[PDB]
Design an enzyme around this catalytic site. Structure first.
Site, short mmCIF file in Angstrom:
data_model
loop_
_atom_site.label_atom_id
_atom_site.label_comp_id
_atom_site.label_asym_id
_atom_site.label_seq_id
_atom_site.Cartn_x
_atom_site.Cartn_y
_atom_site.Cartn_z
CD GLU A 127 -3.15 -0.60 -0.26
OE1 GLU A 127 -2.99 0.44 -0.87
OE2 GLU A 127 -4.03 -1.39 -0.71
CG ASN A 178 -7.84 6.98 -4.88
OD1 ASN A 178 -8.17 7.26 -3.73
ND2 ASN A 178 -6.87 6.15 -5.14
CG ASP A 199 -12.93 8.29 -6.26
OD1 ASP A 199 -11.85 8.84 -5.89
OD2 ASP A 199 -13.54 7.46 -5.52
CB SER A 214 -11.14 9.69 -2.90
OG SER A 214 -10.75 8.55 -3.63
CG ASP A 228 -6.06 5.36 -1.45
OD1 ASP A 228 -7.24 5.58 -1.28
OD2 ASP A 228 -5.72 4.40 -2.12
CG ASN A 266 -10.55 6.40 -0.71
OD1 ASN A 266 -11.68 6.80 -0.67
ND2 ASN A 266 -9.74 6.72 -1.61
#
Ligand SMILES: [Cl-]
Ligand SMILES: [Cl-]
Ligand SMILES: [Cl-]
Ligand SMILES: [Cl-]
Ligand code: NA
EC number: 3.2.1.17
Length: 129
Positions: free
Chosen positions: A35, A46, A48, A50, A52, A59
């Site tokens: 990760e 991301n 969309d 968002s 992380d 997220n």
């Protein structure tokens, strides 16, 4: 902070992730490696809108507030910057919530793709736990 593998194992254990929802500690260490490369400061945008955050790449669509993900939730009741701290308490507490949500550790793409079904005990090999 960039944790060492066993250093992160120990932190995750002290903060209660070992066997949390039935996921042995190695799963969590493995997820963190893939990760964030064990880097508490990791961020990754991301598609969309968002982002992380942190060692476990939690997220901002659902879990933390970053001020720039419209109509998202903040189910962990934390600013996403909290998840970037050297101290992983906030990340772990939020991780507990996520894994509890229905989907288990499938919530972490890196865990599904790189850790699920693999020898995750390897990630805690050598560690004084
Ligand atoms: Cl906030
Ligand atoms: Cl910590
Ligand atoms: Cl599960
Ligand atoms: Cl394990
Ligand atoms: Na949010």
């Amino acid at each position: 902070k960039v944790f060492g593998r066993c250093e992160l194992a120990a932190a995750m254990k002290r903060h209660g992730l070992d066997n949390y929802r039935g996921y042995s500690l190695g799963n969590w260490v493995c997820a963190a490696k893939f990760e964030s490369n064990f880097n508490t400061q990791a961020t990754n945008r991301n598609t969309d809108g968002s982002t992380d955050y942190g060692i476990l790449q939690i997220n901002s669509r659902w879990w933390c507030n970053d001020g720039r993900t419209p109509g998202s939730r903040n189910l962990c009741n934390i600013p996403c910057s909290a998840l970037l701290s050297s101290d992983i308490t906030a990340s772990v507490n939020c991780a507990k919530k996520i894994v509890s949500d229905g989907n288990g550790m499938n919530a972490w793409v890196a865990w599904r793709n790189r850790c699920k079904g693999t020898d995750v005990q390897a990630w805690i090999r050598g560690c004084r736990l």
